[PDB]
């Protein structure tokens, strides 16, 4: 499968999440995603084909994971934006007030601005600390997807937010949205990964 940020993948033929970013670990190909999407060794599938398995994850506390893929997958330095693509150029962290967009299988590509950092989400499973908050909307299924600036600087992977009864926070004003992501930097260093860029 061609690995692009934002596309859907399933875990153990049940749950769906979105791909965050293509990365490598030495000769190993992989993608970073949300830790709540799967447990170690859960199987990931893209378009019904097995592409790899969860190699590690942390959740709750943090919300991160990386899936190691088979040699046959094609890693691409890109994030989906409708039918088009945003090129990944690096991982400079943007500051509060910067504009940012996110990509995922449920709401597509949505943009907004970062409104706060070091936010704690109190999930049913336990707290997740140190998240960054943006006001781009998102829905159930967007988890693990890419958060990126239009300039191509990868920010992190979708964790959660205040989804309403319709499954997203797109029907409430930006001023009232809390959409959270896990910072990419600590995930790259924790697992020794390098981002694929173009």
């Amino acid at each position: 499968a061609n690995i692009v940020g934002g596309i859907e993948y399933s875990i153990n033929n049940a749950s769906l999440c979105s791909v965050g970013f293509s990365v490598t670990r030495g000769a190993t190909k992989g993608f970073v995603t949300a830790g709540h999407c799967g447990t170690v060794n859960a199987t990931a599938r893209i378009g019904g084909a097995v592409v790899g398995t969860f190699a590690a994850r942390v959740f709750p506390g943090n919300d991160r994971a990386w899936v190691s893929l088979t040699s046959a997958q094609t890693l691409l330095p890109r994030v989906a934006n409708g039918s088009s693509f945003v090129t990944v150029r690096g991982s400079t962290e943007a500051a509060v007030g910067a504009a940012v967009c996110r990509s995922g299988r449920t709401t597509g590509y949505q943009c907004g601005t970062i409104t706060a950092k070091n936010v704690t989400a109190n999930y049913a499973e336990g707290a997740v600390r140190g998240l960054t908050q943006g006001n781009a909307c998102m829905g159930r299924g967007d988890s693990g997807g890419s958060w990126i600036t239009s300039a191509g600087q990868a920010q992190g992977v979708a964790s959660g937010g205040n989804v309403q009864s319709n499954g997203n926070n797109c029907g409430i004003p930006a001023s009232q949205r809390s959409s959270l992501f896990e910072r990419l930097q600590p995930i790259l260093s924790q697992y020794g990964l390098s981002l694929v860029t173009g």
Partner: peptide, 4 residues
Amino acid sequence: AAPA
């Protein structure tokens, strides 16, 4: 907030 909820995970996703």
